[PDB]
Design a protein around this nucleic acid. Structure first.
Ligand SMILES: [Mg+2]
Ligand SMILES: [Mg+2]
Ligand SMILES: [Mg+2]
Ligand SMILES: [Mg+2]
Ligand SMILES: [Mg+2]
Ligand SMILES: [Mg+2]
Ligand SMILES: [Mg+2]
Ligand SMILES: [Mg+2]
Ligand SMILES: [Mg+2]
Ligand SMILES: [Mg+2]
Ligand SMILES: [Mg+2]
Ligand SMILES: [Mg+2]
Ligand SMILES: [Mg+2]
Ligand SMILES: [Mg+2]
Ligand SMILES: [Mg+2]
Ligand SMILES: [Mg+2]
Ligand SMILES: [Mg+2]
Ligand SMILES: [Mg+2]
Ligand SMILES: [Mg+2]
Ligand SMILES: [Mg+2]
Ligand SMILES: [Mg+2]
Ligand SMILES: [Mg+2]
Ligand SMILES: [Mg+2]
Ligand SMILES: [Mg+2]
Ligand SMILES: [Mg+2]
Ligand SMILES: [Mg+2]
Ligand SMILES: [Mg+2]
Ligand SMILES: [Mg+2]
Ligand SMILES: [Mg+2]
Ligand SMILES: [Mg+2]
Ligand SMILES: [Mg+2]
Ligand SMILES: [Mg+2]
Ligand SMILES: [Mg+2]
Ligand SMILES: [Mg+2]
Ligand SMILES: [Mg+2]
Ligand SMILES: [Mg+2]
Ligand SMILES: [Mg+2]
Ligand SMILES: [Mg+2]
Ligand SMILES: [Mg+2]
Ligand SMILES: [Mg+2]
Lengths: 68, 114, 155
RNA sequence: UGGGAGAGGGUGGUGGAAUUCCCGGAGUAGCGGUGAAAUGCGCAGAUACCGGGAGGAACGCCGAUGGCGAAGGCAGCCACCUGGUCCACCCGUGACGCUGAGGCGCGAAAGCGUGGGGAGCAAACCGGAUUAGAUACCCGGGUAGUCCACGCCCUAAACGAUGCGCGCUAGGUCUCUGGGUCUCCUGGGGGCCGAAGCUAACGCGUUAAGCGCGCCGCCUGGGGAGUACGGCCGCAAGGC
RNA sequence: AAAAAUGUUCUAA
RNA sequence: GCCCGGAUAGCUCAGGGUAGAGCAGGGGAUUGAAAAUCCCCGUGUCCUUGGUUCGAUUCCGAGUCCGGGCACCA
């Protein structure tokens, strides 16, 4: 199950789209790899940067702890 | 006295120190591989961490401590043994969460860790 | 052994009690092949225990043996460059053999003159949890309880 | 002309993790450390836990076998300024090109000067162990320095140990990034495997180490020696 | 995930 | 000269009804060993003397010896 499938059409630069973007972070806050993300090379760079912005605006975590 | 609290497992390749706190994180009591007469390399073993956990809970339960949320730090070989010991002690282990400190590539480690 | 295990040698049951445990024991009493001498010692001791505390001696003998079986014992291991005291349980075979060994061994420690008295008196003490072969077995089990820290080095 | 990719460079700002320190709380007999130890630290309240504060450096995940750069080298994020480069259309100039002794500029780390900064780390140094010794490795401390600004130094396994440009000589496969008519076709990079051929062999092989041409740099047995003398550069170290 | 230093000269048949 | 203290195993140190722990000692498991570890084992008129209590490490009185302390010194 990859995230590009589990989501319809989205904008890879709306750094304010928490509902879209948070789907791209593991349970432990890390930016998922393409093997999870499903984005291409070029798409993955765009997503991460806009993820990184949303972390600075407090919209996304930099890290969450791990629950069992 | 308090009923529920938190159980913290700091556990390196050297030792495993368990402190039980209260809901506010203020320590109720504590123990480690030193509180059971181990000194040296032995303080870092799984069994050392078990007795350390058992001495932690048996000291906290002796304060009415019933429910603990288990916060775990480090990676030492006494880590898993401590969690197992907390569920066997008698405490109502209500959670387990790994809060091991990890830098985002910050301070340069000692030569031992590069 | 390197290739396959050692196949445990089955002994002929002794002609008095029909017991392989008696046989292995008499073999532990035996020195230089003088089995009949060792047969007399075990049997003349068997009489004495039927005297002193009149009981079926085979039942006393099996209480001594049972009360000497060590359930744990330290063993040396390796990891990196260490030679620990690793607490490892004892196989039922080695359980029996250490008993038989320490039985005769600690019995020969005792101070009475003739052998069957030494054999009988240790089996009387060991069937009640006293005497040499017990203080050795218990002592072994004590050292393993101590090094339970190095139990995670058990294979 | 219209586009695209990018850790390319410079300046200002800025975010979170983490370590150290301080403060308050709470709490007690140890912590830390190693092969095992000791030194160290701790009842003068440490360690472990929570809350608050300060300051420095480095940017986890993304991240790659990736990208960019002439090389060294470049990685949070934001903006500004600036370079190179690629593609499309085939529009403009009309051989305006190639290379390049000198020259000039750039040039990892370390080092140097004047200020600043200093959390972590750590040459030197001290201590603990180890050992016959241990001016080492391992452990606890620790000053330069690591960081910033400006000015020097100009070295390197500065490597692809492979100068630059052009043309020519099978393909298969993976990838980055453009264009198309989007199967796939085509450019420009990045690797792999391999035709012919090259190679002392290893290997190279449209990213040539093949076939050619141009220009440059360099080699001419090892050691002495990258030393001496000279000269030039440098504050020095020392470079050429 | 590594305790422990060394082996006089010429000859290698 | 007086105040405050100690004395308990070989060394230190714990203390009304126990006589203790660790380290030095010894055997033992261990190893190439030097150790670290692990087991058990010993080592008392609790300085002496008189009493308190049914009984004394403890309590008291005394002194015996050694520690600390302060003042003095014609
Ligand atoms: Mg937008
Ligand atoms: Mg330790
Ligand atoms: Mg343009
Ligand atoms: Mg505090
Ligand atoms: Mg100290
Ligand atoms: Mg105090
Ligand atoms: Mg202290
Ligand atoms: Mg500061
Ligand atoms: Mg034209
Ligand atoms: Mg014309
Ligand atoms: Mg430079
Ligand atoms: Mg530098
Ligand atoms: Mg400087
Ligand atoms: Mg340091
Ligand atoms: Mg030293
Ligand atoms: Mg040293
Ligand atoms: Mg020495
Ligand atoms: Mg150091
Ligand atoms: Mg410093
Ligand atoms: Mg500079
Ligand atoms: Mg390289
Ligand atoms: Mg060269
Ligand atoms: Mg050239
Ligand atoms: Mg490139
Ligand atoms: Mg290509
Ligand atoms: Mg060929
Ligand atoms: Mg040729
Ligand atoms: Mg060949
Ligand atoms: Mg070949
Ligand atoms: Mg090839
Ligand atoms: Mg090709
Ligand atoms: Mg020469
Ligand atoms: Mg020179
Ligand atoms: Mg040089
Ligand atoms: Mg000169
Ligand atoms: Mg080694
Ligand atoms: Mg020599
Ligand atoms: Mg007086
Ligand atoms: Mg004494
Ligand atoms: Mg004196």
């Amino acid at each position: 199950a990859k995230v590009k499938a589990t989501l319809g059409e989205f904008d890879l630069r709306d750094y304010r789209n928490v509902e879209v973007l948070k789907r791209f972070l593991s349970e432990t806050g890390k930016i998922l790899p393409r093997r999870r993300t499903g984005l291409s090379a070029k798409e993955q760079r765009i997503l991460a940067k806009t993820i990184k912005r949303a972390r600075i605006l407090g919209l996304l975590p930099f890290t969450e702890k791990l629950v069992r | 006295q308090v009923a529920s609290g938190r159980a913290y497992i700091h556990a390196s390749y050297n030792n495993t120190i368990v402190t039980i706190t209260d809901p506010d994180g203020n320590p109720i009591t504590w123990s480690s591989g030193g509180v059971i007469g181990y000194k040296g390399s032995r303080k870092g073993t799984p069994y050392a961490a078990q007795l350390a956990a058992l001495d932690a809970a048996k000291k906290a339960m002796a304060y009415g401590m019933q429910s603990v949320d288990v916060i775990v730090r480090g990676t030492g070989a006494g880590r898993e043994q401590a969690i197992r010991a907390l569920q066997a002690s008698g405490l109502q282990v209500k959670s387990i969460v790994d809060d091991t400190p990890v830098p985002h590539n910050g301070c340069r480690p000692k030569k031992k860790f590069r | 052994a390197r290739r396959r295990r050692a196949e445990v040698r089955q002994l002929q049951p002794d002609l008095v009690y029909g017991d392989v445990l008696v046989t292995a024991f008499i073999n532990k009493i035996m020195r230089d092949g003088k089995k009949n001498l060792a047969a007399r010692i075990f049997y003349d001791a068997c009489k004495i225990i039927q005297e002193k505390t009149g009981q079926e001696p085979l039942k006393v003998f099996k209480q001594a043996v049972e009360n000497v079986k060590p359930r744990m014992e330290v063993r040396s291991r390796r990891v990196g460059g260490a030679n620990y005291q690793v607490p490892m349980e004892v196989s039922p075979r080695r359980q029996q053999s250490l008993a038989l060994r320490w039985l005769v061994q600690a019995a020969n420690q005792r101070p009475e003159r003739r052998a069957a008295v030494r054999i009988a008196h240790e089996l009387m003490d060991a069937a009640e949890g006293k005497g040499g072969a017990v203080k050795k077995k218990e002592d072994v089990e004590r050292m393993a309880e101590a090094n339970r820290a190095y139990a995670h080095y058990r294979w």
